[PDB]
């Protein structure tokens, strides 16, 4: 749920 | 308080509505699942009720550069975009007011912290374009 891109 | 030319404007609250869920049939990317996600935009009236955001004749979602053709244009409320991906990201939503009254860049964050979540943003809108002013009357005082 906290996955984020760069 | 407003100053100078910004006195001749009204504030309206926009609500950005985001939903997302995992797509199991898509292979995870580096063990991260791929999710389908959607963003829509509505306008709130003086009482807080959602109404179609007809004060915009165009919305452009400026997606993270990992998306193909990442600038996605929509012309009809609620300007719903649907995409798939594996990571959240900040994204600017350009909303274009009627009668060339102006672009507003609304900062959004697309994330997977909830299955669905809503964020409100206040924008300032000029009162010098007759068709826009008439449209603005639907959502409150002008």
Residue numbers in the entry:
A (entry chain B): 5 to 10
B (entry chain A): -4 to 137
Pull text from the paper:
One of the major and widespread PTMs is acylation of the ε-amino group of lysine residues. In this study, we elucidate the significance of π stacking components in targeting of acetyllysines by the YEATS domains and report a previously uncharacterized DNA-binding activity of the human AF9-YEATS domain.
In contrast, when complexed with H3K9cr, W81 adopted two conformations, with r1 and r2 providing maximum π stacking with the crotonyl amide and the crotonyl alkene moiety, respectively. Neither the complex with propionylated H3K9pr peptide nor the complex with acetylated H3K9ac peptide had the r2 conformation of W81, indicating that it is a unique feature available to the unsaturated acyl modification but not to saturated acyllysine modifications.
